[PDB]
Amino acid sequence: DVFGPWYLGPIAHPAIGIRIPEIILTGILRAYKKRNVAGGLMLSFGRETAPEWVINAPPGKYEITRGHTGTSIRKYMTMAAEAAVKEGLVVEIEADHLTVAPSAAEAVKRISGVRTEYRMSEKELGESLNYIKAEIDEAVSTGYVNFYTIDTCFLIDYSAEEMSPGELESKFSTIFGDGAGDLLKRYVGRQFVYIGERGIPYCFTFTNEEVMRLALKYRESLKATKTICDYIKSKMSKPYGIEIAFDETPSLTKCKDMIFYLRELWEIGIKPDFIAPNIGFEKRKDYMGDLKVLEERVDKLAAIARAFGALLSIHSGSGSSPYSGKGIGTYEALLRATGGKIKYKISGVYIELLFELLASYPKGSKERGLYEQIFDDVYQFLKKEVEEEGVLASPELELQLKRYEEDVKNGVREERDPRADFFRYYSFVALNLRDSSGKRYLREAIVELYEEDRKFKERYDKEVEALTLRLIDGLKFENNIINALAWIRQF
């Protein structure tokens, strides 16, 4: 009998972040149980979660952005595993975005519309890797981790695309040496053909110059991915999978880049189950492009991933509102493009939902008082970050803060609107703000409200379940457990 944490393999499934496992797990597991779903439960190792020793550190040691949910790796993994065992459910415990980066604030800025174009030192690379290993150690120590997403997008060298032909060749020869010819031979003068769900065969060929650029573009990303995957392999006594996070990049993912990246991974002995391309999805927004163009693009990239025994993993899955999915028509275009064989990720949307729910109670109520305190403390914390040029300060944040001010001044927007841009993007800091005794006072209050107020618990659980069911029914994950067991049985 199969239940609790299992590695599900490259099969269609939702994977859902649990920023406050205490309040979110009931509604999610209800929905999973109702639609007979094998789902993932996760948090991002670069931003949302952190090791215990980061979480339990005193105020001020670590940037607000590191483990900003207040939820440790041990905690989310143990709570989710144990909840699932208790509910008789198969789930996958995933470590989302193992992120190479100089800081969590940079990893956050990256997905909040902030132009930083920072460049990492060698010591920084080393420490980021050590941070990741330590995070891994905590995951492994729980006995429950099934799956890791690796994010080395910070290491992608965009200068390789702009090098002079003479500089290019010279660097290529020097780096790759006697392996240069082998590397070119894998690609140049070959017609690659990948067939999508549509039945359209897509043709790709490569010039030497293209291969040389791709190779220089991705060498550091590939090397770090290798180091991370070797460390995971050295520590895991149970089977697991890898996802490549390839989505937090400045432009759309190109077909040839992905062919190359997956193939080079393959050459060094890494076969991801999932790859997450940039397809034009943005955090906190319904899809803002042409649905036909989207389907076309996803059909191609899905076909490519398929030939490497992989599915696409869709990040930035939540949209403009907790109720909007990712826009009308968006799920249908993804399903046609993938025949339903797809992994889809959401996380932050559950806290947006929490906050708007609190905001919807009447002034006079404690629920709404709590909301207003959250909003006020966030606003003031961020003003102070801009004021003191703290770690989250940026021109973009400053503008959003001014936009909110202007709008309330001109009666365009009401005070404490949870839809104000700055709050939508930066409300996450609420869960890591601390009182003078260093407690996460707002996260503690939320959990208290939930644990002690029966009517609040009930309404939130219903909203969480409902949101998870919209995702499940929208992307046809109902009964996906069948393929998960077909994978597991093979072992």
Ligand code: NI
């Ligand atoms: Ni993501």
